[PDB]
Design a protein around this ligand. Structure first.
Ligand SMILES: O=C(NCC1CC1)N1CCN(C(=O)c2ccco2)CC1
Length: 119
């Protein structure tokens, strides 16, 4: 019922995501010299370095907020991709599955801890 445990759990999950070759495209912002139209399509850029920095700054209040920003990485890839069979989009789907498989217990435990705190 540790209300704070989600933060280190998310740090370790981000470490695992940074070890995944599938995170390569999502570790830093999109360069506009490489993708000049990116911001015509994507209103809110997001990447895993930004998520990690936000977490380490103490600027997430809950793992739900972190989850929303991670899910934005993946929705941005789905919105930007010209094809559902693109390399970078295909990498996003595997990384998303990995992320969802691991974040589920982090969210469940946090929400359970908060309920216990308010019992
Ligand atoms: O340049 C990127 N990353 C930073 C570079 C890797 C170090 N991008 C990742 C996001 N992105 C897509 O999701 C996408 C879908 C289809 C094609 O690209 C655009 C390219």
């Amino acid at each position: 019922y540790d209300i704070q445990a989600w933060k280190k759990q998310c740090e370790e999950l981000l470490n695992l995501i940074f070890q995944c070759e599938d995170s390569e495209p999502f570790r830093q912002p999109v360069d506009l010299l490489e993708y000049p139209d990116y911001r015509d399509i994507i209103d809110t850029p997001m990447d895993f370095a930004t998520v990690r920095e936000t977490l380490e700054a103490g600027n997430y209040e809950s793992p739900m907020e972190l989850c929303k920003d991670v899910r934005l990485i993946f929705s941005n890839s789905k919105a930007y991709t010209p094809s559902k069979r693109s390399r970078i989009y295909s990498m996003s789907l595997r990384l998303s599955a990995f992320f969802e498989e691991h974040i589920s217990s982090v969210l469940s435990d946090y929400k359970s801890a908060l309920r216990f705190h308010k019992r």
